[PDB]
Design a protein around this ligand. Structure first.
Ligand SMILES: *[C@@H]1O[C@H](CO)[C@@H](O[C@@H]2O[C@H](CO)[C@@H](O)[C@H](O)[C@H]2NC(C)=O)[C@H](O)[C@H]1NC(C)=O
Ligand SMILES: CO[C@@H]1O[C@H](CO)[C@H](O)[C@H](O[C@@H]2O[C@H](CO)[C@@H](O)[C@H](O)[C@H]2NC(C)=O)[C@H]1O
Ligand SMILES: O=c1ccn([C@@H]2O[C@H](COP(=O)(O)OP(=O)(O)O)[C@@H](O)[C@H]2O)c(=O)[nH]1
Ligand SMILES: *[C@@H]1O[C@H](CO[C@@H]2O[C@@H](C)[C@@H](O)[C@@H](O)[C@@H]2O)[C@@H](O)[C@H](O)[C@H]1NC(C)=O
Ligand SMILES: [Mn+2]
Length: 267
């Protein structure tokens, strides 16, 4: 599948319950280390297996290439293919992770694609997934159902009429963090080449899901995904799945907070 790097893992021997696919660029070593020491730490969660992998492309920098090679050797949790790792190549990065699930971890019950600047409560997520009784063609996160392409020309998410010619986008979930049943990876990979390309990964995936007639669903009666970020509180963070706008130092402090208060009860 042209994977310069493959994780040292065997999903047939121990099928994971939840696989985390984390996007980060080569220089963001601090982010990856904070995740590996916090919510990305592999463990049983209510007896369910959690695995964490980092999606990376390639870089022109010889120094960064070397560092990432050493990191892969030392940690074995990097999935890599030869594509220029840049913001407007995030669609390739996403499709690489989905390809990895399809070819090497079709046993995964659930897969979460997430950003590096995020806080994820796998405990609460696992609890909600076990409660949802939705194991096939399932896809959730922060639902974006009536979106219009951004035509403001210097905007990060700007798309020309040539890049996306229609007035509205299909349903999709924030690329900050979305979750799906493992089977969906195979279906998306399968239809990927037939769907109109878009440089925005979450929209691209939304196009594929629409082609597949897979409808987006809310994970819970209450909001659990926060692309806009949140005011921090131990009690609030115990009852959410994902929060954006979290830098590495902050992530470590939040993880420590939750550890320090483990054992107290909340309203
Ligand atoms: C996305 O990554 C692809 C693959 O690396 C980039 O395409 C290559 O661009 C390099 C220059 O960096 C050329 O030398 C190659 O001929 C291209 N190869 C292919 C297969 O296209 C592409 O430029 C990247 N996208 C963006 C927006 O930077
Ligand atoms: C003010 O919030 C922003 O509002 C725009 C619409 O006006 C849009 O909903 C933004 O979400 C982004 O939408 C992009 C496609 O247009 C998508 O590729 C990005 O990943 C979205 N970003 C987030 C944070 O989900 C929204 O931020
Ligand atoms: O070349 C790049 C640029 C960004 N990212 C990742 O893509 C996600 C989105 O980037 P960022 O948070 O900077 O932007 P946002 O989409 O929250 O505006 C993050 O996990 C980044 O680490 C990446 O893997 N490669
Ligand atoms: C998930 O299922 C729980 C167990 O209910 C039993 O099993 C499911 C698969 C159905 O066949 C149901 O008719 C059975 O009684 C429920 O307690 C729980 O509410 C379900 N969760 C949701 C979100 O509906
Ligand atoms: Mn981000």
């Amino acid at each position: 599948g042209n994977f310069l790097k493959l994780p040292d893992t065997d999903c047939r021997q121990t099928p994971p319950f939840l696989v985390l696919l984390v996007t980060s660029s080569h220089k963001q070593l601090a982010e990856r280390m904070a995740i590996r020491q916090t919510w990305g730490k592999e463990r049983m969660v209510k007896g369910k297996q959690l695995k964490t992998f980092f999606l990376l492309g390639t870089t022109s920098s010889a120094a960064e290439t070397k560092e990432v090679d050493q990191e892969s050797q030392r940690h074995g949790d990097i999935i890599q293919k030869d594509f220029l790792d840049v913001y407007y190549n995030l669609t390739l990065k996403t499709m690489m992770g989905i390809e990895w699930v399809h070819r090497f971890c079709p046993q995964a019950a659930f897969v979460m694609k997430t950003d590096s600047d995020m806080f994820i409560n796998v405990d609460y997520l696992t609890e909600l997934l076990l409660k949802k009784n939705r194991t096939t063609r399932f896809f959730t996160g922060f639902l974006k159902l009536n979106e219009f392409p951004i035509r403001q020309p210097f905007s990060k998410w700007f798309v020309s009429k040539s890049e996306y010619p229609w007035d509205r986008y299909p349903p999709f979930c924030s690329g900050t963090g979305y979750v799906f049943s493992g089977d969906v990876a195979s279906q998306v990979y399968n239809v990927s080449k037939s769907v109109p390309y878009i440089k925005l990964e979450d929209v691209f995936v939304g196009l594929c899901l629409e082609r597949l007639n897979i409808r987006l669903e809310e994970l819970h009666s209450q909001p659990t995904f926060f692309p806009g970020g949140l005011r921090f509180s131990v009690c609030l963070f115990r009852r959410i799945v994902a929060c954006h706008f979290i830098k590495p130092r902050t992530l470590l402090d939040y993880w420590q907070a939750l550890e320090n208060s483990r054992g107290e009860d909340c309203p």
